[PDB]
């Protein structure tokens, strides 16, 4: 048993809810929250900028030190940093940016990072401002992640569409 509430069970291990990941994280304080990041860990907008704003920019300060030491992430890669006031840990995961010409087949690689964590709160990767279709993103997730993933979908129209079109 875990503390995630009102989630709609989609498969053995994938759950979905119409919720803002920032508000979900603040309420649940999960072991792992996933950030949909970029290779530079530049959290200006979207999930990244919203989580970072919720940390009062502490996520960005920590991220800048990480990059100065280690250099950029790979598209499809990840790093574990602090969850600040939102979670124990933040798993920063880079899905492909299809508006940058980045291989959509790297989205599966992005979601493989989730398998290193038994339970995660996560958004849909590569959709929204990375240009890919949310319906496709949810499909890749279900077919790749084997650990227990709680998906917070911010847009109600999309959530209703993701559920209604789920095979």
Residues 80 and 91 sit within 8 Å (Cβ to Cβ): yes
Check binding of 50 to ligand RF0 (CB under 6 A): yes
Q: What minimum distance in Å lies between the beta carbon of 135 and ligand RF0?
A: 11
Which of 38, 76, 128, 149 forms a contact with ligand RF0 (CB under 6 A)?
128
How big is the site for ligand RF0, counted in residues (CB under 6 A)?
14
Check binding of 21 to ligand RF0 (CB under 6 A): yes
The residue among 28 and 152 lying less far from ligand RF0, judged by its C-beta, is 152
Measured CA to CA, the distance from residue 95 to residue 103 in angstroms comes to 9
| Strands in 30-156 per DSSP E | 32-36, 78-82, 89-93, 119-122, 148-153
Measured CA to CA, the distance from residue 104 to residue 101 in angstroms comes to 9
Q: Which residues form the interface with ligand RF0 (CB under 6 A)?
A: 20-22, 46-47, 50, 123-124, 127-129, 134, 152, 154
């Amino acid at each position: 048993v875990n503390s995630f509430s009102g989630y709609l069970k989609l498969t053995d291990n994938v759950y979905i809810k119409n919720a803002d990941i920032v508000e979900e994280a603040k309420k649940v304080k999960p072991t792992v929250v996933v950030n949909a990041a970029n290779v530079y860990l530049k959290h200006g907008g979207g999930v990244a900028g919203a989580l970072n704003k919720a940390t009062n920019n502490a996520m960005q300060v920590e991220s800048d030190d990480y990059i100065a030491t280690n250099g950029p992430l790979k598209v499809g890669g990840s790093c574990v940093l602090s969850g600040h006031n939102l979670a124990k840990h933040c798993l920063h995961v880079v899905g492909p940016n299809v508006n940058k010409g980045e291989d959509i087949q790297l989205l599966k690689s992005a979601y493989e990072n989730f398998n290193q964590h038994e339970v995660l709160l996560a958004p849909l990767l590569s959709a929204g401002i990375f240009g890919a279709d949310p319906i496709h993103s949810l499909r890749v997730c279900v077919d790749t992640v084997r650990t227990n993933v709680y998906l917070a979908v911010f847009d109600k129209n999309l959530y209703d569409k993701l559920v209604s079109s789920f095979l």
